[PDB]
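ligand=flavin-adenine dinucleotide
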Amino acid sequence: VPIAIIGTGIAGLSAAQALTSAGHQVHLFDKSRGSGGRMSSKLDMGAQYFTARDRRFATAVKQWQAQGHVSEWTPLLYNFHGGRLSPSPDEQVRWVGEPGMSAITRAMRGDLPVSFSCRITDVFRGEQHWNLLDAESENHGPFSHVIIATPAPQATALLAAAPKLASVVAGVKMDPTWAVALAFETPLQTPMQGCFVQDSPLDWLARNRSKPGRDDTLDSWVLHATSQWSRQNLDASREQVIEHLHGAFAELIDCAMPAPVFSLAHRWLYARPAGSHEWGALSDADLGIYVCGDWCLSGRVEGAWLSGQEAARRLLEHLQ
Amino acid sequence: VPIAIIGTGIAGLSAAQALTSAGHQVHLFDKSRGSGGRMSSKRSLDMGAQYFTARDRRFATAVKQWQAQGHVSEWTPLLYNFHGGRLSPSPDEQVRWVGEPGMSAITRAMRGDLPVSFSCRITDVFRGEQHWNLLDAESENHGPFSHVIIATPAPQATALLAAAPKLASVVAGVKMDPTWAVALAFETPLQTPMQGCFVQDSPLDWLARNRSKPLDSWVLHATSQWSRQNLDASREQVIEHLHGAFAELIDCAMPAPVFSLAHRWLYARPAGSHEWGALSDADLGIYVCGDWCLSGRVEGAWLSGQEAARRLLEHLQLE
Ligand SMILES: Cc1cc2nc3c(=O)[nH]c(=O)nc-3n(C[C@H](O)[C@H](O)[C@H](O)COP(=O)(O)OP(=O)(O)OC[C@H]3O[C@@H](n4cnc5c(N)ncnc54)[C@H](O)[C@@H]3O)c2cc1C
Ligand SMILES: Cc1cc2nc3c(=O)[nH]c(=O)nc-3n(C[C@H](O)[C@H](O)[C@H](O)COP(=O)(O)OP(=O)(O)OC[C@H]3O[C@@H](n4cnc5c(N)ncnc54)[C@H](O)[C@@H]3O)c2cc1C
């Protein structure tokens, strides 16, 4: 009788990897067509790069490097502050999935059992086992334990069996992010490959072809709006969002810009936790339900990975 | 720009009526194919709420209007109690109301011709700078809406309150208990005068004889304790165990039933009473109601809905 894991982003797959290394059977659930969550699923329109400040996470990254799924990104980075573009060099080590951000989670998932396009709506337990109800009213189960690995607002629905936990998780605010991708046939005549942006609807842009192993055919750019701007335009249409963020991009760039080959927009309602936490993970070991996610920690890739590990560590102790 | 109401149980429709009586347009959503929520009749069997009492004078007044309209009747069953292996008559001084021809007729009459989207499960609720918006399970946007009233069981409301985390954390602490309900029907009526029974020391909490509301069919409700212990049992097993509990307590022949159904209510009733009335973030424009804001009875849900609408109407002058 397997462990159910709800959410196949970094946190859920990290918990999955830990449990499977320990010999246990898992079954994964995601409402999306594929895995990866805010890493994006197999242009990098979600998470852009990540850093490793935790030695344990650093170790996992070295393992991903040796498996061929992560590499270092050293873009020529700029800053846009008060109407001025300026180079902003550093020596920060930044990692990206290769050949896209989605590659890390895809490899973590591997051949594990998974039910995609499966939105869980309820999680409840009998005297022994857990059961999941999905949005098509179908039952899934039995399961011995349940790990919730969703953004906090989406986990609260799944924690009715533990209202004290639900109440804590429901307090966790997430900020939204609108993303836009733009692709040019003629590359933009700038050496900029990424930019931290102030005083603008944008706070970040990245030049996809500067990342290792990406396709060079088009010069594609990813634009991330601030949370404040995203909130203010949360119900804007994709085409208005494209137009505004494209305009912001045209206003800070130092060079000419032809018409894009295509343009995309994507809204994340629950993109980033509003603040940081130190919980690591939240568990009701008595009932067998565990909660993890980036929002249990720093709200970065590293946080999500560490949270999934902590959830699985606690489950493993109690199994035994 | 209309007010969105998410849930077409009696709390949501009560809010709807109060808002529409005040001249304000609403739009109703429900994930089910029809309205009534836990006051729903299955096609006729009351599988959720069985009867209701009116103790609040305001709610009584509404019941009497419904009664004049033909949608409720006073139910006068021969009531029994089963205590310690003994079944005894248990008449009392409480007036009990039911919908007529079914418990659903009340909510159906309240909804009337109001705008409604059925089979529409809302999964996120968020606002831009101006208006509120709803996402459904098909990823379809609904809106713009001027305000939003959440009218669902508390565990189902938390996912819709992400725009108001403080409210969300309050709503999320509200425990709801499950009930397994079973309906059975017999070819020849059971040779007992009993028409209702309060049950102790049994998997069963309650049972009612349908034909005694204004084939001999019966509804059985299990205790929340037994329901939790068997929350993942199959329908056939539930039918079997609860039919058995009924055959054990009754004191006449009970031939095999000729029809049987089981229905699980995960969120049947709040585990405790509350005194909130409604919950709200009126500055943001989101309001929350349900039976679990008050007593966990039909009356509490109705009152909660009135209270949510009253709060919203009163706050308009500050907007
Ligand atoms: C625009 C954007 C840019 C970012 N940039 C960076 C960056 O530059 N650096 C960085 O370190 N981090 C960044 N992040 C954050 C990083 O992506 C996240 O911290 C990390 O990917 C979160 O992983 P997770 O497993 O906690 O959650 P998620 O990746 O959200 O995974 C949750 C999964 O659960 C699924 N799910 C949700 N509800 C249900 C349900 N009811 N039933 C079934 N499945 C469900 C979702 O579909 C999803 O797959 C960014 C995020 C966004 C949105
Ligand atoms: C077995 C049982 C027996 C009961 N017996 C009695 C009794 O004898 N006396 C008594 O007074 N009370 C009884 N009750 C309680 C009474 O039924 C409730 O107090 C009252 O009906 C609750 O009304 P409500 O509008 O708050 O919620 P509900 O009736 O639950 O309505 C909520 C509605 O919201 C909808 N909804 C939920 N989530 C979403 C979503 N995400 N998107 C869209 N729509 C959604 C649901 O489909 C439902 O229609 C009983 C309940 C049960 C289950």
